[PDB]
Amino acid sequence: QTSNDYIIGLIKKCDDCEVSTSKTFFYCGIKAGASYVENDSPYLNDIKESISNGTPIKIYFDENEPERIISVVKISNSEEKNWNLNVKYDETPFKTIEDLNRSFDFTTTEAVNFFNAMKNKSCAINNQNLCIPFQYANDGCYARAHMMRQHMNYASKDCYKIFAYGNLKVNTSSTGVCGIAWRYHVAPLISVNGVWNVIDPSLFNQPVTITTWLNKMKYNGGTVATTSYQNSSVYYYDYVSNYTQYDNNYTDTYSTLANYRYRQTSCSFL
C-alpha cells in the first residue's frame, strides 16, 4: 500500500471513540476527526512509542480511506526542528468576550460580502489553486480558517479564532443524514455592530452568532464541552495541554488546502 497523504505531528489515543476489538483509534496531529489503525498492524508499537516519548512522527493515511493509518515513520532532525519551531505552550490570553472587546470591525454588508467572497472560493464552486475545501467537512477547519484570515488581512481587516471542543456532531446533509464527528472545530470571529459573528461557510450560508454556530454542533446528542478565543495568528490551540501551533507563512494552510482540494465529505454515521 502506498499513499501521498501524510502529516507530521503528535498522536494521542482517542478516549471517547467507538469500542472495537480490531481497531484502535487515535487523533493525529491537529486533525479535528479521529483516525484508526488496525490492531494487528506492524506499526502499532511505533505509534505507542511515539505517544510515550511525546514526539512528532510522520503518519500516512489510506488513499481510499482517509481515516485509516497505513504506516508511521520517525521524522528527521530537520523535520523535527521545523515542527518544533511552530509550537508554543502558553495560556490563551482571552478568557471572556469582554477580553476581545479589548479593523476587527465589519459593517453588516462588509461581513456579508466577505462571507460571500469566501463562499465563492470553495473548491466546489471554483476549483483552482488555493481554493478553500468547504465541501470537505471531515477535517481541515484549521486551514480553512487561516486562509480566510489571510484574505481578511489583505483587505486590512482582522479576526479572532473561536475554537469549540467536545463531542461535536453535525449533520451535513440537507435531505437526509450524513453525520460527521469532531473533537474540535474552529472558524474566524469578527465584530459586526458590536456583536461577534462566526464566519463558517462549511456549516452556514451567512454570518451567524456564536450560539447559532455552537448549536449546529450538537446534532444527534452532540455536546460542546468548552470554547476558546484566540489571536487569528493561532492555527491550532488545545485548551487542555496549552499546545499552540502557528502557521505564520501559511505553509501548512496551503498544504492542507491542496490535500483536501478534491475530497468529498465522508459520512461518519448514517
From TrEMBL:
Q: Which organism is it from?
A: Flavobacterium sp. 316
Q: What is this protein called?
A: Uncharacterized protein
Q: What is the lineage of its organism?
A: Bacteria, Pseudomonadati, Bacteroidota, Flavobacteriia, Flavobacteriales
Which Cys pairs are S-S linked?
Answer: 123-131, 178-267
